[PDB]
Amino acid sequence: SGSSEQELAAIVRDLGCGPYFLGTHDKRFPGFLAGNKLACAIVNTAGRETGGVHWLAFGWNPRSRTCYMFDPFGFSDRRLKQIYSFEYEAMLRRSALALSPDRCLSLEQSTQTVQGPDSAACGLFCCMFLHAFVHWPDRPMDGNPTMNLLTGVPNGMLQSPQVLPTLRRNQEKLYRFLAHHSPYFRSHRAAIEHATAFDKMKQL
């Protein structure tokens, strides 16, 4: 069911993220503390003990002092906390205190879903956003060669029939992009595609 941490680590490396990548973590990810460099991570909403629930991506741009938070579903912090019991305030505090001079950071996050409500490809869309992040850390959410391939639709429209074909096309293009840049993906493709299926939650 979905993507394992090993699977995502291998894809992130294949996409040219490796030098900037902090690894895969559960909800207790510390933040960007080591130094004021270009950095990223893949974080789970739940703690390791649950076995994992939802995958998120975090980026740090030192040039603007911005923490990018990517949720494929584009939920709000209030909605991430309601649904997933996930909050990352302490993380933004530890980071702003350790890296910014004015003790302030900018928090940039998506308002739009790229993923279908039943899909198990959250880990994989996270790999894709991190490819867009490491090549264009100034404009990563949209307006770059990687994120331009996907169609973001308002989050409030997530469980509506009118957007299903847009979100399915996004899932088809997610695989085409990954097959193009990742040998790990190509070699494990049938197992990955099946386990991260657009309609996977309906087939548990």
Binding site: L92, S106, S110, T111, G152
Partner: peptide, 11 residues
């Protein structure tokens, strides 16, 4: 890509 919201957080 996706539309986004940018917020300033001070600690």
């Amino acid at each position: 890509g996706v539309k986004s919201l940018k917020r300033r957080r001070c600690y």
